[PDB]
Tab-separated table of C-alpha atoms and ligand atoms in Angstrom:
chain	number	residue	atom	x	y	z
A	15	UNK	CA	-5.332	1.189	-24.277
A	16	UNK	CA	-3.746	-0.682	-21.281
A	17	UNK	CA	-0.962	-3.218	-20.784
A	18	UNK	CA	0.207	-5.125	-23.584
A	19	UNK	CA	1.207	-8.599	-22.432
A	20	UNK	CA	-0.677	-11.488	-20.178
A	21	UNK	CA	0.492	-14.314	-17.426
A	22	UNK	CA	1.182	-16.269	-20.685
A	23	UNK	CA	3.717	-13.896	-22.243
A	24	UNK	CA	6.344	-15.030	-19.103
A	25	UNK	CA	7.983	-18.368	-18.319
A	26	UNK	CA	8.701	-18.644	-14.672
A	27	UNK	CA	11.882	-20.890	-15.399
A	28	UNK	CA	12.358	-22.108	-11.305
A	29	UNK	CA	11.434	-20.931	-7.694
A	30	UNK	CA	13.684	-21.145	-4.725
A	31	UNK	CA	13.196	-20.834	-1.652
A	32	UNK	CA	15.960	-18.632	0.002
A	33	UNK	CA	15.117	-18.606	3.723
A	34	UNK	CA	12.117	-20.362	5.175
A	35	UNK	CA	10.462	-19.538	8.963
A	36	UNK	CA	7.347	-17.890	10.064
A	37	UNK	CA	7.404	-16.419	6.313
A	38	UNK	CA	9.530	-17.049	3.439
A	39	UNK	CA	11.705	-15.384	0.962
A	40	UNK	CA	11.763	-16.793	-2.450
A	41	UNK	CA	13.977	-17.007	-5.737
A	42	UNK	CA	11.932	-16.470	-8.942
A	43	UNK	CA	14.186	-17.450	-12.257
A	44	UNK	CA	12.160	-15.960	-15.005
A	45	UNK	CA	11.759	-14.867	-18.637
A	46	UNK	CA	9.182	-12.173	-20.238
A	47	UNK	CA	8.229	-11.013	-23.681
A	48	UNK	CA	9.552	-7.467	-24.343
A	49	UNK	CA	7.628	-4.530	-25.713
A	50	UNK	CA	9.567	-4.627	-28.868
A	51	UNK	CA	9.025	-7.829	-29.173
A	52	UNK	CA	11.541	-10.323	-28.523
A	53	UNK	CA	12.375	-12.322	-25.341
A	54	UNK	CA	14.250	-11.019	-22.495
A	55	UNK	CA	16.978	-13.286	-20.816
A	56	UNK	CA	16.877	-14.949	-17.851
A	57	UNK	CA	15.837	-12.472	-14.979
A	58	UNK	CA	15.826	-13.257	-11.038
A	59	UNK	CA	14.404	-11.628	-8.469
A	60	UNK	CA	13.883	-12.157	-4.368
A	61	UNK	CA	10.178	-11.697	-3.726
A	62	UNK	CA	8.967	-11.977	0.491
A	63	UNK	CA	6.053	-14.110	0.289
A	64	UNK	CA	3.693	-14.003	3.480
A	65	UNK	CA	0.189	-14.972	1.442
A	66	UNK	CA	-2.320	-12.741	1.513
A	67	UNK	CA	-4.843	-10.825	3.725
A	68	UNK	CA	-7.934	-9.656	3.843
A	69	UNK	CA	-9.405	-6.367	5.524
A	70	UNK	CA	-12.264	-4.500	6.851
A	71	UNK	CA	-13.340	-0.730	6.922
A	72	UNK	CA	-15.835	-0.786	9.728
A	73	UNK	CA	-18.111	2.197	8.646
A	74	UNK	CA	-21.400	3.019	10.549
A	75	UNK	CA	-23.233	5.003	7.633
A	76	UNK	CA	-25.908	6.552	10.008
A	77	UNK	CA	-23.189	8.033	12.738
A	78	UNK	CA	-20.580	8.741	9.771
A	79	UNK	CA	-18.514	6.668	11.740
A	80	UNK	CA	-15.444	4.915	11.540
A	81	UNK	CA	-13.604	2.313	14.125
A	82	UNK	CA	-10.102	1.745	14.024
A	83	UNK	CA	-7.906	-0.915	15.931
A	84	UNK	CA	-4.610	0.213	17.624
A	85	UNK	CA	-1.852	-1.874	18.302
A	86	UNK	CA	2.084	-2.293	17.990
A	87	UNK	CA	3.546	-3.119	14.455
A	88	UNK	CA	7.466	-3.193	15.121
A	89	UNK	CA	8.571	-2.771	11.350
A	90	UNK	CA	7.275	0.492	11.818
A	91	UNK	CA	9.860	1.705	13.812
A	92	UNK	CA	12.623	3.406	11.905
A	93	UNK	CA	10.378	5.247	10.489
A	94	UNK	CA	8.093	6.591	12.526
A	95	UNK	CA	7.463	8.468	15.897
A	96	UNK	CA	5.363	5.484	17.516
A	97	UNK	CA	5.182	2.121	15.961
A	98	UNK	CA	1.474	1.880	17.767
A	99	UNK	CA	-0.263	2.204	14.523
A	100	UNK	CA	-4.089	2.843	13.789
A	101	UNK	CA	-5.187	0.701	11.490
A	102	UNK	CA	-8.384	-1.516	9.530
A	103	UNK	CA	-9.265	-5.053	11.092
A	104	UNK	CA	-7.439	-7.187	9.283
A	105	UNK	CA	-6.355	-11.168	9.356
A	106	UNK	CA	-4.636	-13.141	7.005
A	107	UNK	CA	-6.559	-15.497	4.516
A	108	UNK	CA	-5.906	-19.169	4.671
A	109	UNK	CA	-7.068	-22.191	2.076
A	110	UNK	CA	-10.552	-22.465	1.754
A	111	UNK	CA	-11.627	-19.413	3.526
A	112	UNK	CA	-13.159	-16.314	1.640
A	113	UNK	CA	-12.241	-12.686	1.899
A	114	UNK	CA	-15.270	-12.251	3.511
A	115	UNK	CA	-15.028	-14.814	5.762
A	116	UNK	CA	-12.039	-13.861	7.339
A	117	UNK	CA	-12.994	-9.917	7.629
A	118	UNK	CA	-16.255	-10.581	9.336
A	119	UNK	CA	-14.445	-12.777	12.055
A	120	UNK	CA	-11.464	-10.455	12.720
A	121	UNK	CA	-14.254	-7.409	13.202
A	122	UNK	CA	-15.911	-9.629	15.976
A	123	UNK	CA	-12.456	-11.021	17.508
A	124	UNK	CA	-10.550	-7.528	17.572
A	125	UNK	CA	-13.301	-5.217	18.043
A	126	UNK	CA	-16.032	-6.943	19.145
A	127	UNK	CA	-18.069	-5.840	16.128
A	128	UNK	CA	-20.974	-7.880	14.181
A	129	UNK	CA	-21.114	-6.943	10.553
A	130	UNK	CA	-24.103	-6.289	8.619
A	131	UNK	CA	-24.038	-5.714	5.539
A	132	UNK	CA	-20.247	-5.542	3.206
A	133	UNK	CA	-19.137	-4.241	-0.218
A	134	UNK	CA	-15.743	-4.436	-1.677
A	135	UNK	CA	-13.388	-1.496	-1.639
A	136	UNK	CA	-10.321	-2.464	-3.514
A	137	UNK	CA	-7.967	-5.240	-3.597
A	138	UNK	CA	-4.191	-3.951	-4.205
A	139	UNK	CA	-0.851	-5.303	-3.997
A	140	UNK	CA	1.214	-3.977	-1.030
A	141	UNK	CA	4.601	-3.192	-2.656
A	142	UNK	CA	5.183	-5.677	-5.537
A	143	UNK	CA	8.434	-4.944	-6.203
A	144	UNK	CA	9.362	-7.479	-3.605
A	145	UNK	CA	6.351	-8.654	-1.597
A	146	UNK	CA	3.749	-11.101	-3.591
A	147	UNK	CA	1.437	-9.659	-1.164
A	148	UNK	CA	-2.155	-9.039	-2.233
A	149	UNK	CA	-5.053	-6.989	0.273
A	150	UNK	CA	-8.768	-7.389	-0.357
A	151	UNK	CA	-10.235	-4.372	1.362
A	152	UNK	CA	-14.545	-4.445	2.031
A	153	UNK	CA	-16.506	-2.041	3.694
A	154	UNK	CA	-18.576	-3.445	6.649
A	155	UNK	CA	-21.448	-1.756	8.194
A	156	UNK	CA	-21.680	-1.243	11.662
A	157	UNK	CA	-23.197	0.414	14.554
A	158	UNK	CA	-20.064	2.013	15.697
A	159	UNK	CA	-21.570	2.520	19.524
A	160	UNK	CA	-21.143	-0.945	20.254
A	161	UNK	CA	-17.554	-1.134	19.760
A	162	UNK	CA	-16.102	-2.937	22.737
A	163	UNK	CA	-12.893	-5.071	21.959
A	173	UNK	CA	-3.250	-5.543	23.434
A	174	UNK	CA	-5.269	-3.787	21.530
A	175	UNK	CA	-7.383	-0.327	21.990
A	176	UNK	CA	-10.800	0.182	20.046
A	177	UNK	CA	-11.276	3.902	18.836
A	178	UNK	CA	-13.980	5.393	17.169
A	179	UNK	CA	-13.845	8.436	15.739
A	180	UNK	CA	-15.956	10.465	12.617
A	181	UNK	CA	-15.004	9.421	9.307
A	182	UNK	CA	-14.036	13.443	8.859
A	183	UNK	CA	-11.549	13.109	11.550
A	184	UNK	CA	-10.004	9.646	10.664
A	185	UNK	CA	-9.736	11.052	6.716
A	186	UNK	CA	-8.182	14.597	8.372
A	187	UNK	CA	-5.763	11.992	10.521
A	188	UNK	CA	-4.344	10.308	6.598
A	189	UNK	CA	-4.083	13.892	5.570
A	190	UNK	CA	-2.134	14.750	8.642
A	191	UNK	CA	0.158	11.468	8.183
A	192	UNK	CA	-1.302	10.097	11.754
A	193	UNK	CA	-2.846	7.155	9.897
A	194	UNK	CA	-0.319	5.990	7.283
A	195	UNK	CA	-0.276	2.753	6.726
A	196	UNK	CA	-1.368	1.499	3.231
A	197	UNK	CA	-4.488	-0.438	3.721
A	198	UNK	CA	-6.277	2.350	6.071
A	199	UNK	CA	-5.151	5.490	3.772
A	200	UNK	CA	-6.762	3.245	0.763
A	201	UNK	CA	-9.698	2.316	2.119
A	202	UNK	CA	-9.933	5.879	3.866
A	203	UNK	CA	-9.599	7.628	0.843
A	204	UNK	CA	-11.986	5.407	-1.075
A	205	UNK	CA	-14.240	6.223	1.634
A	206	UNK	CA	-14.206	9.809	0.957
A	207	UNK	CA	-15.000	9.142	-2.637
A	208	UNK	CA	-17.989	6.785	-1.825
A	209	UNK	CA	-19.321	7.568	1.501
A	210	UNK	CA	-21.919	9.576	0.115
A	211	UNK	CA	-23.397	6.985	-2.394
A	212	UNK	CA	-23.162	4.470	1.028
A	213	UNK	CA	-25.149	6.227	2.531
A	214	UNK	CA	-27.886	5.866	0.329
A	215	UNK	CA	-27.463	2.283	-0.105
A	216	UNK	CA	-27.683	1.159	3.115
A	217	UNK	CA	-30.548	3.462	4.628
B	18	UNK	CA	-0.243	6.780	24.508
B	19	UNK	CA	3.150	4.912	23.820
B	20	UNK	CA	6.622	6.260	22.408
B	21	UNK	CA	9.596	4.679	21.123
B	22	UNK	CA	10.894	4.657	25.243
B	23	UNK	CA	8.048	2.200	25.491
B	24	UNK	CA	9.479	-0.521	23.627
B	25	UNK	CA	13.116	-2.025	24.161
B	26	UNK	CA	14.449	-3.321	20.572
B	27	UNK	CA	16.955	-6.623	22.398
B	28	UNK	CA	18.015	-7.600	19.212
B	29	UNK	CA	17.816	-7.773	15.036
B	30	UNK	CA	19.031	-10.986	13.776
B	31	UNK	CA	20.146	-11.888	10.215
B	32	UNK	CA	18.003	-14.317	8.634
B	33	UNK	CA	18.967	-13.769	5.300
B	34	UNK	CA	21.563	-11.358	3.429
B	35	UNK	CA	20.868	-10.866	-0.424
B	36	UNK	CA	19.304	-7.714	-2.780
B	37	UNK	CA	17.164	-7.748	-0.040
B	38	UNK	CA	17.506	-8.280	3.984
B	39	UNK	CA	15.396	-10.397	6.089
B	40	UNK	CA	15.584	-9.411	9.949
B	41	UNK	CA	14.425	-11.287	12.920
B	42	UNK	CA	13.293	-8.238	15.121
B	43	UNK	CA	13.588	-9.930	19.008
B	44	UNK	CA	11.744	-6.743	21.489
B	45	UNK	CA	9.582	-6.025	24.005
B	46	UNK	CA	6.962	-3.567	24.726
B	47	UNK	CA	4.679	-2.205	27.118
B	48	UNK	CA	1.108	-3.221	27.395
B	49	UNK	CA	-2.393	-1.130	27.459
B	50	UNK	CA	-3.231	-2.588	30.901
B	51	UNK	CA	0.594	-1.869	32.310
B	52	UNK	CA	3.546	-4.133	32.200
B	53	UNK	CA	6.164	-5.226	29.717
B	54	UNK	CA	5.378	-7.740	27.171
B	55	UNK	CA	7.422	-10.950	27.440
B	56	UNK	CA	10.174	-11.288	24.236
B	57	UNK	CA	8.355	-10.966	20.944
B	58	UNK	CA	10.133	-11.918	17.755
B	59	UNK	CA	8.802	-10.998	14.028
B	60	UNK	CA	10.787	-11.545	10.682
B	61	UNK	CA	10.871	-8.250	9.024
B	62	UNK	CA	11.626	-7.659	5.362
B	63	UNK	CA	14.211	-5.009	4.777
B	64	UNK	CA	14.259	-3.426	1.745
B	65	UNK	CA	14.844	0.040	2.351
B	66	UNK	CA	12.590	3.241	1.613
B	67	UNK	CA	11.317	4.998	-1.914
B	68	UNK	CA	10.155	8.422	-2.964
B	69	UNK	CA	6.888	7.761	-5.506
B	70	UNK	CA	5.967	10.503	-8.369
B	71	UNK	CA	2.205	10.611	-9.807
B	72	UNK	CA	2.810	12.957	-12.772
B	73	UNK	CA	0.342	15.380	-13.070
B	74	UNK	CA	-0.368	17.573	-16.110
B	75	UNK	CA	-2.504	20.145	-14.970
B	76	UNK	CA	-3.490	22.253	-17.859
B	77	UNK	CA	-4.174	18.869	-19.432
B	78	UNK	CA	-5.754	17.195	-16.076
B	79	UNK	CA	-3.641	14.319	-17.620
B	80	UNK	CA	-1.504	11.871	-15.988
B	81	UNK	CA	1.727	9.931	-16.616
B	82	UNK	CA	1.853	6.114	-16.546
B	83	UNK	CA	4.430	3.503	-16.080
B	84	UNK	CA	3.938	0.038	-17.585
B	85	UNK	CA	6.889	-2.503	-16.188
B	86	UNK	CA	6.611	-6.830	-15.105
B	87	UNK	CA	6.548	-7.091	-11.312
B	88	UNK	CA	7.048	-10.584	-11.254
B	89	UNK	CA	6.090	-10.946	-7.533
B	90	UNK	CA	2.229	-9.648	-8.765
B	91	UNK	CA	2.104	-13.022	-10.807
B	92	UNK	CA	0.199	-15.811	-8.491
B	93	UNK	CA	-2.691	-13.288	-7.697
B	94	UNK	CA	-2.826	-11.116	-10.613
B	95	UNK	CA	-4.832	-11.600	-14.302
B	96	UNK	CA	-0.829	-10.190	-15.705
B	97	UNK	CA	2.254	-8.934	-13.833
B	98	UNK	CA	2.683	-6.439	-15.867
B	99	UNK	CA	1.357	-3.192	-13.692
B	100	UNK	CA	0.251	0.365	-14.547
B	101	UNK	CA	2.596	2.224	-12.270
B	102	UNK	CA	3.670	5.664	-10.542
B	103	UNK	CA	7.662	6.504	-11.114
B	104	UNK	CA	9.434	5.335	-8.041
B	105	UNK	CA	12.659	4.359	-7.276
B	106	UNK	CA	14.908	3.233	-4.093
B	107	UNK	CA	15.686	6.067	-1.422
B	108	UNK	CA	19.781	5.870	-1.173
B	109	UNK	CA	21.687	7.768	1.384
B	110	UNK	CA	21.566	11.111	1.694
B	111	UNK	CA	19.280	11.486	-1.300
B	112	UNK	CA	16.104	13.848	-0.717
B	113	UNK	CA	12.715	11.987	-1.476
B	114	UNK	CA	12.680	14.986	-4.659
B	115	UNK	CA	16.021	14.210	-5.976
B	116	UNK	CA	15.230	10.828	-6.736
B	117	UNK	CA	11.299	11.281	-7.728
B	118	UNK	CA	12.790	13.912	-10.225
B	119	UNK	CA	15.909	11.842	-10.821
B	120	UNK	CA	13.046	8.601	-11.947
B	121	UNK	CA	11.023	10.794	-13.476
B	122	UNK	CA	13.233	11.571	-15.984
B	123	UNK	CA	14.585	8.516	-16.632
B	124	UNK	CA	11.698	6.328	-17.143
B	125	UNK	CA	9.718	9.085	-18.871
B	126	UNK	CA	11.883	11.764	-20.383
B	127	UNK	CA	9.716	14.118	-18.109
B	128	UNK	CA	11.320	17.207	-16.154
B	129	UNK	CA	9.021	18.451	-13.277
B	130	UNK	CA	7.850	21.442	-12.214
B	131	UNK	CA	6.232	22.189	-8.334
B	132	UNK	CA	6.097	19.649	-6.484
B	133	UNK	CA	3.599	18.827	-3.609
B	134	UNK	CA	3.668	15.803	-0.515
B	135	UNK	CA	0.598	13.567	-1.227
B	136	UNK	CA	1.818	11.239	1.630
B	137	UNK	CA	3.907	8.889	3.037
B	138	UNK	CA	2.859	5.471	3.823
B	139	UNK	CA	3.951	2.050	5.227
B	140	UNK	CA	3.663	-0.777	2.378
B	141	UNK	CA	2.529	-3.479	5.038
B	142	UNK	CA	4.100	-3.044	8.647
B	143	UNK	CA	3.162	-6.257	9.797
B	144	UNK	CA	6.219	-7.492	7.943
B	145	UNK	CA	8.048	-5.019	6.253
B	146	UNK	CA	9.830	-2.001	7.348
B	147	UNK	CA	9.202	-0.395	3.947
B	148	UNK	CA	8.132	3.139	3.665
B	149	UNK	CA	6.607	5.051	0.443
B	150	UNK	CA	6.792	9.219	-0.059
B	151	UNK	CA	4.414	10.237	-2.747
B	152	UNK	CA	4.923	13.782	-4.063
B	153	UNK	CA	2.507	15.045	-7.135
B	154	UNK	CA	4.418	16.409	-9.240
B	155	UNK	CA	3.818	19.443	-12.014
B	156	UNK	CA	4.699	18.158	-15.538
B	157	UNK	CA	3.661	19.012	-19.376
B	158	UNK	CA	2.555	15.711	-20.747
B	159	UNK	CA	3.277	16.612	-23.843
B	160	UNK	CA	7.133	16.167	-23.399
B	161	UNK	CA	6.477	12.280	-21.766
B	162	UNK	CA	8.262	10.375	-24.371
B	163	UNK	CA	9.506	6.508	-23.638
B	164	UNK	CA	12.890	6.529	-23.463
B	165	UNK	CA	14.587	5.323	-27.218
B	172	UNK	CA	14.815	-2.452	-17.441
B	173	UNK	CA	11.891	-2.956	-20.180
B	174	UNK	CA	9.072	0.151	-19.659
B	175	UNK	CA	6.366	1.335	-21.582
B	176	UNK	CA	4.910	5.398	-21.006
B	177	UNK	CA	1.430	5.674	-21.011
B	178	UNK	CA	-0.662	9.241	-20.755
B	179	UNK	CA	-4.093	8.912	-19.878
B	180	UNK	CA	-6.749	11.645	-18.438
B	181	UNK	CA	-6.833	11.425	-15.010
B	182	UNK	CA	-10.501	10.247	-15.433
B	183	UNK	CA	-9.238	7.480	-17.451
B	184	UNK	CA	-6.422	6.314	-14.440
B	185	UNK	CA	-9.037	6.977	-11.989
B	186	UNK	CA	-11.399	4.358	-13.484
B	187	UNK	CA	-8.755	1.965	-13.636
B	188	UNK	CA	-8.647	2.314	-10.060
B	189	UNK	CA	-12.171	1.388	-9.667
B	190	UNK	CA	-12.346	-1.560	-12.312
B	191	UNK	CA	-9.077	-2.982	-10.759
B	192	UNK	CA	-6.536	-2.284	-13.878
B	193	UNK	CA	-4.333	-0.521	-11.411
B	194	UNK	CA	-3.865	-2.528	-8.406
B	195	UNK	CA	-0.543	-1.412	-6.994
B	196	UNK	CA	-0.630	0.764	-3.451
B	197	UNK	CA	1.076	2.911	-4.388
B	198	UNK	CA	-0.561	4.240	-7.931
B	199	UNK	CA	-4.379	3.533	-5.593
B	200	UNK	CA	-3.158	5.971	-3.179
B	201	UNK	CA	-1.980	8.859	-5.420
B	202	UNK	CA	-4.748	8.200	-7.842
B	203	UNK	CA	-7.195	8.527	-4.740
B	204	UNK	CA	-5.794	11.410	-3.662
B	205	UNK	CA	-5.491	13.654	-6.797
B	206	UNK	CA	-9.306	12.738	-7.214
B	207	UNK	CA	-10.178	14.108	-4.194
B	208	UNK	CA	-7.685	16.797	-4.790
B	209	UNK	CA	-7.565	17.858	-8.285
B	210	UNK	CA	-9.958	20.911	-8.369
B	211	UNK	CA	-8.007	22.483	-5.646
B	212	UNK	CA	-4.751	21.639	-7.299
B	213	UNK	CA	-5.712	22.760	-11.411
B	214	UNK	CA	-6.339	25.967	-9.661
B	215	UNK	CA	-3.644	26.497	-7.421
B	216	UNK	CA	-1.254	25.319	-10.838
B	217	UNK	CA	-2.896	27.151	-13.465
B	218	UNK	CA	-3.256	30.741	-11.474
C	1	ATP	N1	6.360	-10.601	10.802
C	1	ATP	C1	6.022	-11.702	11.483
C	1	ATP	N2	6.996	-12.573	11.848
C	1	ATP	C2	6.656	-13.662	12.543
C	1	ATP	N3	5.444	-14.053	12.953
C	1	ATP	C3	4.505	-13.179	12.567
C	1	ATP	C4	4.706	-12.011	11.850
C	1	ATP	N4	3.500	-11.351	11.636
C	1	ATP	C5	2.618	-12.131	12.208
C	1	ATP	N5	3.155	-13.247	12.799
C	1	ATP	C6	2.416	-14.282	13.515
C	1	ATP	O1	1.082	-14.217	13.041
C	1	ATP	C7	0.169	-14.146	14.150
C	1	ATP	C8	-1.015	-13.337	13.683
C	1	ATP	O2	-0.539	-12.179	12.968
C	1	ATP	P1	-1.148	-10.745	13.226
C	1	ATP	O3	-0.834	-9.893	12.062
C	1	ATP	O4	-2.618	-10.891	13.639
C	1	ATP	O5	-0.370	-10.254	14.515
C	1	ATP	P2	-0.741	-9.568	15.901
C	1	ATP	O6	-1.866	-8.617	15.727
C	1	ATP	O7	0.566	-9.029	16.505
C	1	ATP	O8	-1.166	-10.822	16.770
C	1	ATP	P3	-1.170	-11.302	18.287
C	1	ATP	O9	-2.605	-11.037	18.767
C	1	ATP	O10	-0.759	-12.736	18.385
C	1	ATP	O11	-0.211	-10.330	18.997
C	1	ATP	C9	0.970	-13.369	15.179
C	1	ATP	O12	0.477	-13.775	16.453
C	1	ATP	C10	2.363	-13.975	15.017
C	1	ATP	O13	2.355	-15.265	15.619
């Protein structure tokens, strides 16, 4: 079956905007058809808006390779041992650009990798109970050996970076997702780019 | 190689006080090539922590849906209604079970059996502090009734939900990552919960 109702079956009433800096944090005032089939009231909610992103899974098919970028993400700090994180190339999308755009520069500017060949993964929404903030994930194929370049380039086997999400040492959303998706798919990759 | 000693926290600022928190985070932190980074600020969104519950019927190899509006998915999404995993806010002192179990039951009417970690993953830690504890969790889908703020219970195989994974129809990180995982899983996990 699926979901019942469209974008047409709300009325976004007003947005606010609550605080305004590098990011902002907005009001929505809003009203939604109901499942029953009347008209809720008027509902508000804070959403963080910080537009959108787009990122790359550098995979080198014919090592079975992945690369992965480290660097410091403070958020992560209360909960977690390090906030170093390992995580996708990744850069935020602005007007006029395309998803792919943006991916294949951020794999030459943080790791010093040229792109062949992408595919899309997946594009998700991070946590939209409060965050409007939407990820388009591709696949990129690369010759992992060249991998050059703060920030510290690793490459490592796509078995051991999909053993390191098992073992919660890579746990942040958009490398677990496009890990796992790997996993899935790498096989069928394979084949297409030989 | 770095640990929380290499990083000095000077300072979280209010920026904003509502349902939510906004924090300016002022640190700094050491470098790969050796020193201390100058001051670094970053607004952080502050919204706390939640324990996540992909209902899994394993007899059935069926799983439990959630249909709610997100309201924030509405500028980049064909509807903001999502297909969802039960998940709720982490409060103190509350286990990341007692409140899967706690949603689970009253979004879907569904009591759970064994329980298993998936994972536990940060939303987007650019910019938000906000971490995510999946757990799978053993249930008979044919006790999920809706209940009687405005959700809808779907049951669906789990190829069904997987698909929807692939063609986009579920979208959210959180339902992508335990849907991912209890493909890759599943055979492992029927057995282990039908032996
Ligand atoms: N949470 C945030 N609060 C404030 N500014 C931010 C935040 N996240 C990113 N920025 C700004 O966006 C720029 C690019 O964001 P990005 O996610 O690439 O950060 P980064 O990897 O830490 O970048 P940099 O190489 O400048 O250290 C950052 O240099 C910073 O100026």
């Amino acid at each position: 079956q699926g979901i019942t109702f469209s974008k047409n079956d709300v009325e976004i009433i007003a947005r606010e905007t609550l605080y305004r800096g590098f990011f902002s944090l907005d009001l929505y005032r809003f009203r939604h058809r109901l499942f029953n089939g009347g008209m809720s009231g008027e509902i508000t909610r804070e959403i963080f808006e910080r537009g959108h992103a787009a990122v790359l899974l550098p995979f080198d098919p014919v090592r079975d390779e992945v690369v992965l970028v480290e660097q410091i993400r403070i958020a992560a700090y209360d909960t977690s041992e390090s906030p170093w994180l390992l995580e996708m190339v990744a850069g935020m999308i602005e007007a006029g650009e395309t998803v792919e755009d943006v991916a294949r520069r951020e794999a030459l500017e943080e790791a010093g990798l040229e792109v062949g060949r992408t595919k899309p993964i997946l594009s998700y929404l991070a946590s939209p109970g409060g965050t409007s903030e939407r990820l388009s994930i591709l696949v990129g194929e690369v010759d992992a050996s060249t991998a050059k370049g703060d920030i510290r380039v690793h490459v490592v086997s796509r078995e051991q970076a999909y053993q390191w999400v098992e073992e919660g040492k890579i746990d942040n959303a958009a490398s677990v997702i496009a890990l796992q998706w790997l996993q899935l798919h790498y096989h069928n990759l394979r084949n297409e780019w030989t």
